[PDB]
Amino acid sequence: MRLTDVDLTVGEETREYAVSEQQGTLFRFVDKSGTVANNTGVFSLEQRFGAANSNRKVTMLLTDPVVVKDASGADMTIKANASVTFSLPKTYPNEHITKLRQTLIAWLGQQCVSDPVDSGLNNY
Amino acid sequence: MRLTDVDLTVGEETREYAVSEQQGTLFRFVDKSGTVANNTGVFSLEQRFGAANSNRKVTMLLTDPVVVMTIKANASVTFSLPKTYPNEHITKLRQTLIAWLGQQCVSDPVDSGLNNY
Amino acid sequence: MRLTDVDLTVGEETREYAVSEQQGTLFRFVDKSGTVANNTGVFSLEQRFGAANSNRKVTMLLTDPVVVKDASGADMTIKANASVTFSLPKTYPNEHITKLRQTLIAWLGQQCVSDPVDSGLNNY
Amino acid sequence: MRLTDVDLTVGEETREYAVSEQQGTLFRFVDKSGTVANNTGVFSLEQRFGAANSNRKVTMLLTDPVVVMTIKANASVTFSLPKTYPNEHITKLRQTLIAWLGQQCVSDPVDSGLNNY
Amino acid sequence: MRLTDVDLTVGEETREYAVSEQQGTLFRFVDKSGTVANNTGVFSLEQRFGAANSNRKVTMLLTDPVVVKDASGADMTIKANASVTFSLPKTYPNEHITKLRQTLIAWLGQQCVSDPVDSGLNNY
Amino acid sequence: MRLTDVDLTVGEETREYAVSEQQGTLFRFVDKSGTVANNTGVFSLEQRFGAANSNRKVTMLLTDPVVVKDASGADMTIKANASVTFSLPKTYPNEHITKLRQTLIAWLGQQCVSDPVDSGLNNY
Ligand SMILES: [Ca+2]
Ligand SMILES: [Ca+2]
Structure with a gap:
């Protein structure tokens, strides 16, 4: 697919991502809420x-960092990670791969x- | 939660899983529509x-075998969650x-x- | 199956068992006729x-202990064991497994x- | 007992076994419906x-092969019975x-x- | 017993626990008013x-943690523990065991x- | 507390203890239904x-002994024990301690x- 910026409906909010890089077999989006800095x-x-x-x-990696108060009170950034990996044999039919993703x-x-x-x- | 057999709406079909084991920190469901173990x-x-x-x-593992010989395909998800990280933002992460x-x-x-x- | 206490009809009597422990792949019932002690x-x-x-x-193990008189006359406890083992290949159909159990x-x-x-x- | 061919009511079907060997302390029945040894x-x-x-x-061994190649599944029962143990309670054990x-x-x-x- | 969530009457308040894990010989409840973080x-x-x-x-372990301000002002989480252990011989009768627990x-x-x-x- | 004999309500019976010793950090009660011999x-x-x-x-120790007939017929005295231990840090507040005990x-x-x-x- 020709990559385009993506808008996801997440519960009752809308999250907007923008394409950050695309390689032959790899791509990366960034949340438009953020900066290079933050x-x-x-x-x-x-x-x-x-x-x-x-x-x-x-393989997919989704990283969500949040700023949390320190026990002393300082500002500290903490990341939470989620990673998915699909192992798909080349004799397995594409239909059932779609079935798998949806399940x-x-x-x-x-x-x-x-x-x-x-x-x-x-x-x- | 109290584990109960689960029915998932998958596209235009319905998959029906039954509880197959419950340990302390581990559980396992099984597709009811299965005829053989494989x-x-x-x-x-x-x-x-x-x-x-x-x-x-x-960690979660989803295994969906199909008959062609039977061939198995796997999806595996892993959530790494620091304890100080807030439960609300975790729910957010899962939904996204x-x-x-x-x-x-x-x-x-x-x-x-x-x-x- | 969600485990519950079990009542078995045995010949012309009724035997009542209660759940004693349940693990992921193991469970154990005890005959309600008995104590921890006996x-x-x-x-x-x-x-x-x-x-x-x-x-x-x-694999299943059924143990039935009985108190018997000693040759001297003392009270002595004697166990009788029965053990079943199902070896079921993962290409064998569940229907025929049920057939096997019933036969x-x-x-x-x-x-x-x-x-x-x-x-x-x-x-x- | 005097061994005779046996017919078992298995769920809603009837299995029919024939005596295949009798030794001193050992006997063996065979499913009449079998076409081949395997x-x-x-x-x-x-x-x-x-x-x-x-x-x-x-000890008892029950072998039920099925064609998929033919695959065999086994059930094996073993009764350990002390001699002083009473025959009545043995009948009880078997029934339970x-x-x-x-x-x-x-x-x-x-x-x-x-x-x- | 079929383990399910319980609510305890504690003086003039109600304490709500939820099953957090159940194993063959072990189980654990968690106070519903809490988080992994707190x-x-x-x-x-x-x-x-x-x-x-x-x-x-x-053996039973009850742990109640409380947040307390520090002399430095920093917030500090402190745990208090209660542990009960019943040593019960097999020949001891279940009746007198219940008596012991109630006393x-x-x-x-x-x-x-x-x-x-x-x-x-x-x-x- | 000024230690004196106590009577406990235990299910549907009443259990009567009497002070058997009081030391600075230790005390001991004895069930009034008993003898040094039994x-x-x-x-x-x-x-x-x-x-x-x-x-x-x-730390608390509760001991209930019971007489039980032996397989030999001889009379045999058997003890069952319950032991409770509270580990309470100094900075932990007395209020939440009472909470712990009641829970x-x-x-x-x-x-x-x-x-x-x-x-x-x-x-x-
Ligand atoms: Ca491009
Ligand atoms: Ca369970």
């Missing part, structure tokens, strides 16, 4: 096409995934 | 809470990852292998 | 999911299985 | 009577094992691999 | 069922116990 | 007020605690 968010994606016996692999989105929506991620509570 | 897709999640200087880590996984610039390489240009 | 029966089940080349395995139940009902187990007589 | 399911039982200080042991093998908490891991939680 | 209370219990000769042990609750209510625990004053 | 219950509590850097510790009483009342303690069954 960064608000980054997203990166890279594909690694292996040999015909190897599975091709696709992952659905799972990431679920409360049984939300509670440990968002708040640290395990399910029982 | 036929059967699975989803597992585990949290590893670290020391106070560490970040807690949550969902949104990203929606986009074309992600589907084109994942689904069909087209890189962006 | 035990009347135990049942345990564990599953071992191997690698994709390995068969998954499922095993039927066989355990048979007189040709009952005579050696219950009384020690071999068949001829 | 196609054919089998069931075998053997008693090993020990010394007076030992427990007698009875049957009852247990009926239950969901046993079928879910055996049949489909779901652990209990 | 924890407010945890309770954990484990049973070590001993060898046939030994007693079985049950311990009664004692923990008494002023001769609360005064040294709560305020650090000894009895006389 | 003891029926003891409770003891000690505070180790720590160094200025350390936490102070309060421990509440927990000890709960079924998720009584079932493993009283009957040896784990939760699930």
